[PDB]
């Protein structure tokens, strides 16, 4: 469980924090 959003879109992705 990571903290990535819109991962399926390598350009629209927003990373909130460290995974797990």
């Amino acid at each position, epitope marked *: 469980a990571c*903290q*990535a*959003f819109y991962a399926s879109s390598p*350009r*629209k*992705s*927003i*990373h*909130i*924090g*460290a*995974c797990a």
Partner: antibody
Amino acid sequence: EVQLVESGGEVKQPGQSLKISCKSSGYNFLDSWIGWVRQIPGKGLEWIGIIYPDDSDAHYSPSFEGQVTMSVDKSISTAYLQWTTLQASDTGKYFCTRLYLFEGAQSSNAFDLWGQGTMILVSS
Amino acid sequence: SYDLTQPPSVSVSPGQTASISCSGDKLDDKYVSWYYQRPGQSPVLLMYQDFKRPSGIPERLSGSKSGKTATLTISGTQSLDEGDYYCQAWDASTGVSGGGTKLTVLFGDGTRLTVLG
């Protein structure tokens, strides 16, 4: 170089509608989220929301959702922010900023590019 | 939707090391970014993902984290360092309505760094 140029400041009266703009240049407009931040005189930075120009997906701060509307015009690389009804509490400097995606070991995002801001005075 | 707390004021003498704290309840699992703003100017990105500083930012600016606190340490504080400082993070809330996730940008109230000149 790459930059965001915001529309000029204005003075409106309570009840009026308003639409301010932000034109980017030097990078692919559709590929980076555009956020909007407010800053009332003396106060700190308040978040209004973010919108992705390619499909206009948006996230609004619970405080502004329904009070303001974010949107972009792809054909001219411009993000907008509008009100149908202005209030005195809307007074302040509005910044337009691009959220940059830092790709690496573990990717992250931060607002690297900012507009010069659009001062808006709502007064009688 | 949690709060980000930072001292509205921090004062220091030229050359001294200045420290700007910022804490929030979820900062233990959230990246923090720091911005700088000279009165009447536009914000400037200084740090992102807790300790990574954008190209062009002085090495004297170090970004740290520990528990629910994030810290921006400025060693050898010059005077162009004078200004406001904001920390920021995010929050996500996958709605229980099946689909739909809300993202949130959070800002601290800011710290006014004063260089007694």
